[PDB]
């Protein structure tokens, strides 16, 4: 049975906040933090915000966290405005004299009219990461991983990517869970996917791993860091420092590169039906049989074929786009289409509105053409 699940994170923009934002300047981190994935998984299962602190957060906080960097983001900034044209809520309340009645006893006497409003404009700039990919591989109990995977198969609530406006563009439930001993082998097991054929590929793929305590004792290494993203409560938030190390993985020896597995550009269909293909000659012969080898305009025997429309070319040819006409009519309708730009639908000899033009063109052709130039091809 699998013991560790896999989550895939990708979007056009993402942000994962750090400890260095206690005001209107919101800065982001380089990688999705533990608290973000814990919150998303709580949303996917559908646990209440007041319930996460009661036997639900430490149960998953006992798991081991592992992140792999497929391609890192460009640090981007968006200017945000709050309360344009409106009046905001301010925090001051009048002093209630005696300090004995405070807190919840004071909140029972609160009224909607007791609050006061101020019209101003609150400006902020928020940082987002553009074009970033990550894999979250959480190692826990096989039953717990099964429950987590079943929950993320169909999330109860909607899910986002750190902020509510960052949408998923790849499935989070794309990777089936597996059984591996170490987080390194698990992060190396999930392959690396390409979008289109020619693009830069990172030769080194950084990974973020929790620092294993090893045996009893074993004080923290000098290259380990601290990170305040172990959530204990979510309303109001309570966060706890943790130990984080960094490892690297070179591509081409323990992670393979998958193929493109699709098409990027769209492009229009194929015009230019081939006139030497066997299906074309068979359909042309059958259409010459159907019309009894008579021209459609002037009723002289039929030698060539004109194409009414070019919806299908080469491989498929239903004999309803083809009509039988002779040489003069073919040349006349050919010269009627030199600068028309109608592409798909061509001239129909059955439709009477072209007949008077075609006959005048044929009169021109009989008036002007030199036979001896057509023969002796120079």
């Amino acid at each position: 049975p699998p013991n560790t699940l896999f989550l895939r994170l990708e979007g056009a923009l993402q942000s994962w906040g750090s400890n260095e934002a206690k005001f209107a300047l919101r800065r982001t981190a380089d990688a999705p933090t533990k608290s973000g994935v814990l919150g998303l998984l709580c949303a996917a299962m559908g646990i209440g915000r007041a319930e996460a602190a009661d036997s639900w957060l430490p149960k998953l906080a006992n798991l081991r966290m592992g992140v792999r960097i497929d391609r890192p983001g460009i640090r981007w900034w968006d200017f945000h405005t709050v309360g344009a044209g409106q009046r905001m809520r301010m925090a001051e309340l009048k002093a209630p004299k005696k300090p004995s009645m405070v807190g919840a006893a004071l909140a029972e006497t609160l009224t909607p009219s007791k609050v006061k409003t101020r019209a101003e404009t609150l400006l902020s700039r928020r940082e987002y990461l553009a074009d970033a990919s990550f894999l979250v591989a959480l190692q826990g109990e096989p039953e717990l991983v099964a429950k987590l995977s079943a929950a993320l198969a169909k999330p109860v609530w909607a899910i986002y990517l750190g902020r509510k406006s960052c949408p998923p563009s790849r499935p989070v439930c794309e990777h089936p869970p597996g059984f591996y001993n170490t987080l390194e082998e698990a992060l190396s097991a999930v392959p690396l996917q390409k979008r289109w054929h020619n693009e830069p590929l990172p030769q080194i793929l950084p990974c973020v791993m929790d620092w294993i305590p090893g045996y009893d004792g074993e004080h923290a290494p000098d290259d380990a860091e601290i990170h305040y993203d172990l959530p204990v409560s979510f309303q109001p938030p309570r966060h706890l420092p943790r130990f984080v190390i960094r490892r690297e993985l070179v591509v081409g020896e323990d992670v393979q590169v998958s193929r493109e597995t699709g098409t990027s550009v769209w492009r229009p269909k194929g015009t230019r039906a081939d006139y030497n293909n066997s299906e074309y000659k068979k359909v042309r012969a059958e259409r010459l049989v159907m019309d009894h080898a008579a021209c459609m305009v002037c009723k002289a025997p039929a030698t060539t074929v004109q194409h009414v429309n070019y919806r299908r070319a080469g491989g498929k040819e239903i004999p309803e786009d083809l009509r039988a006409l002779c040489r003069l009519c073919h040349d006349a309708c050919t010269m009627l289409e030199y600068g028309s730009g109608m592409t798909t639908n061509r001239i129909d000899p059955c439709d009477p509105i072209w007949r008077e033009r075609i006959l005048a063109k044929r009169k021109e052709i009989v008036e002007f053409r030199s036979r001896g130039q057509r023969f002796r091809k120079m």
């Binding site: 987002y128 553009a130 899910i159 790849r170 990027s264 269909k269």
Partner: protein
């Protein structure tokens, strides 16, 4: 059950959203720079507008101060390389040269609606939840930001909507990793909708969807594929189809 709305629209030369320096808002995608209209612009663009005002509504849908709003709006993104320009304007005296700037792009948008949270916030009401969903559909199909619209009268109307009822939220923004190059035998909108087509034709090979286009102008897919369940010719008919797929529901 989640109702997901896919949205392609073209827009005339204007400047709807700008930053502190005034520049058209811009994100990074696909190795190049992308024109950008904020999701927090479409919110307070659709919101507090007159057309949308048609248990209390507009609180369960979009929140205000544990409201748990059931509508999520994403950042609009261009389907080609951003091409900004700067205009030079002078002032008269009728008895100095400045600079203004603008950008033109075709944007893909994405709308998602949680039905269960909307029903839960309606205190068990169901006709009101579908009523608010329909109301948001008609608002979102006919709403623009009120930017520099007096000087750049940008009042364009959309060119295609596909609606989805998938199990988990997933966008189609990865279809526009490759920027769209305009060829002679097509335009920008046709190639954008074709790039949308050759990303829904996949995935299933590697759910359902209702599609609408105005008088069936630019049909989804460049073959006879069944990549969309039904192709419809009215906005009201598409909304009625969404309500019909939700259940027995009349508009």
């Amino acid at each position: 059950m989640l109702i997901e709305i896919h949205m392609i629209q073209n827009h005339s030369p204007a400047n709807l959203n700008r930053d502190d320096l005034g520049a058209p808002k811009t994100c990074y995608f696909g190795g190049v720079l992308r024109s950008r209209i904020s999701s927090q612009c479409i919110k307070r663009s659709i919101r507090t507008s007159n057309d949308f005002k048609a248990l209390a509504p507009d609180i369960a849908l979009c929140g205000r101060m544990t409201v748990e709003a059931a509508l999520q709006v994403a950042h609009a993104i261009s389907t080609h390389i951003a091409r900004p320009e700067i205009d030079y304007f002078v002032a008269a005296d009728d008895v100095h040269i400045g600079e203004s700037m603008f950008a033109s792009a075709c944007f893909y948008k994405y709308f998602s609606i949680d039905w269960e949270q909307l029903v839960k916030n309606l205190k068990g009401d169901t006709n009101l939840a579908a009523h608010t969903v329909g109301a948001f559909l008609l608002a979102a199909a006919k709403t623009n930001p009120s930017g520099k619209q007096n000087s750049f009268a940008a009042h364009n109307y959309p060119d295609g909507i596909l609606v989805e009822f998938k199990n988990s939220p997933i966008s189609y923004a990865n279809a526009f990793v490759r920027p769209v190059s305009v060829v002679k035998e097509s335009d920008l909108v046709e190639q954008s909708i074709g790039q949308l087509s050759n990303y829904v034709n996949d995935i299933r090979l590697g759910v359902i969807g209702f599609w609408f286009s105005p008088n069936n102008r630019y049909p989804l897919g460049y073959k006879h594929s069944k990549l969309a369940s039904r192709n419809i010719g009215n906005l009201n008919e598409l909304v009625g189809a969404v309500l019909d797929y939700i259940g027995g529901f009349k508009w």
